[PDB]
Amino acid sequence: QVPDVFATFGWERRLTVIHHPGVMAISKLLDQRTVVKPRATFNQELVEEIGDYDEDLQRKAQVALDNGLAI
Amino acid sequence: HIPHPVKYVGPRRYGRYVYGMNRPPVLRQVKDWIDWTGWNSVFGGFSFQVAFGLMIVSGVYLNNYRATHTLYYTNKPDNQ
Ligand SMILES: CCCCCCCCCCCCCCCCCC(=O)OC[C@H](COP(=O)([O-])OCC(O)COP(=O)([O-])OC[C@@H](COC(=O)CCCCCCCCCCCCCCCCC)OC(=O)CCCCCCCCCCCCCCCCC)OC(=O)CCCCCCCCCCCCCCCCC
Ligand SMILES: CCCCCCCCCCCCCCCCCC(=O)OC[C@H](COP(=O)([O-])OCC[N+](C)(C)C)OC(=O)CCCCCCCCCCCCCCCCC
């Protein structure tokens, strides 16, 4: 059984709603930017477009794409 | 307004600039630029001057040349 919780947002002007305890835990976990990290996945179409702005990144991005890495 | 699609049908990317190689002709590039930024501004911006210029310069023929042969009481020379 999962209890409902109050989730509040804002510092001086605070808005309160009801929310899921697990969903709030995930939300705060994703706010730990140093721990949980976004990672990029490429496709050949977008790797080619990168070269128009950074040639070095295109070569490195190609390596990531060839190995199917989320990096 | 009425939601509509982007009307630009030209090339979305020329590729990385490499000492100006493998790029379209200059006039093609100018046309693509105006296509990309909209012809409505070009027509709107130039419309006022085109209208004023056409009207003033049209007087060269409508007000000056024609008029030289407009006065019906001028072709007649005196003592002739
Ligand atoms: C074999 C051939 C033989 C000969 C045959 C000759 C036949 C005749 C030939 C002549 C042609 C006839 C054509 C007839 C049919 C024309 C159909 C047509 O296409 O017309 C529409 C065409 C364009 O209209 P449109 O389709 O609505 O425009 C489309 C837009 O793209 C729509 O897009 P938009 O609306 O989004 O447009 C952009 C818009 C976007 O704007 C906005 O978003 C709205 C903004 C509104 C508020 C603005 C805020 C205030 C401004 C702030 C910025 C200020 C900057 C400047 C500051 C200046 C400081 C000093 O921006 C603007 O337009 C305004 C902002 C840009 C800057 C404004 C600058 C100031 C303007 C006001 C002053 C104008 C006067 C200046 C005078 C000089 C200086 C003192 O208009 C014309 O062509 C004009 C009329 C033509 C017919 C009358 C001609 C009469 C004279 C003919 C003589 C010809 C010669 C005869 C010789 C005879 C010998 C026998
Ligand atoms: C004589 C007295 C006056 C002298 C002073 C005149 C001052 C005005 C000069 C304006 C020059 C503006 C230069 C812009 C910078 C261009 C940079 C460049 O190299 O771009 C390359 C770029 C390369 O393209 P790109 O890589 O940006 O492409 C973008 C992406 N796609 C392909 C999707 C579109 O191409 C261009 O040159 C684009 C700009 C073209 C702009 C043309 C403007 C013309 C202005 C003069 C108007 C004349 C009107 C005459 C009467 C007409 C009557 C109807």
Side-chain angles (χ1 to χ4, degrees):
Chain A
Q1 192 92 33
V2 189
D4 287 8
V5 288
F6 296 114
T8 307
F9 309 90
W11 178 242
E12 299 186 347
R13 306 154 298 180
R14 305 193 170 180
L15 178 73
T16 305
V17 299
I18 300 173
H19 228 88
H20 201 254
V23 175
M24 291 306 308
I26 293 170
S27 177
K28 295 174 183 298
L29 182 60
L30 299 183
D31 299 0
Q32 307 302 314
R33 309 183 204 282
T34 58
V35 176
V36 177
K37 305 294 293 180
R39 300 204 189 175
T41 59
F42 303 103
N43 61 32
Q44 187 60 82
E45 286 67 61
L46 294 165
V47 171
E48 186 175 354
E49 299 181 9
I50 289 170
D52 301 359
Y53 308 98
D54 190 354
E55 186 177 0
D56 289 321
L57 274 178
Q58 183 185 15
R59 184 187 61 81
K60 302 176 186 177
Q62 187 63 51
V63 177
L65 176 64
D66 298 359
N67 298 268
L69 292 172
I71 191 172
Chain B
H1 92 296
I2 312 178
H4 74 117
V6 176
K7 63 177 66 179
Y8 183 73
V9 303
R12 297 177 175 185
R13 64 190 211 69
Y14 294 152
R16 186 181 59 261
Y17 200 89
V18 182
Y19 311 120
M21 296 158 7
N22 319 293
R23 289 187 119 261
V26 168
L27 279 205
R28 173 76 23 207
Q29 292 180 26
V30 172
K31 204 280 193 293
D32 291 358
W33 177 251
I34 304 161
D35 289 353
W36 209 43
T37 66
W39 270 98
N40 67 287
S41 51
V42 181
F43 298 135
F46 284 76
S47 59
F48 314 101
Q49 212 61 57
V50 169
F52 178 64
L54 285 178
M55 292 161 101
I56 298 290
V57 182
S58 71
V60 174
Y61 169 84
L62 306 168
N63 186 218
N64 181 12
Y65 180 70
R66 286 277 295 183
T68 308
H69 335 300
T70 289
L71 283 69
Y72 68 79
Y73 56 94
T74 295
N75 71 309
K76 318 298 190 310
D78 172 43
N79 314 121
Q80 180 163 309

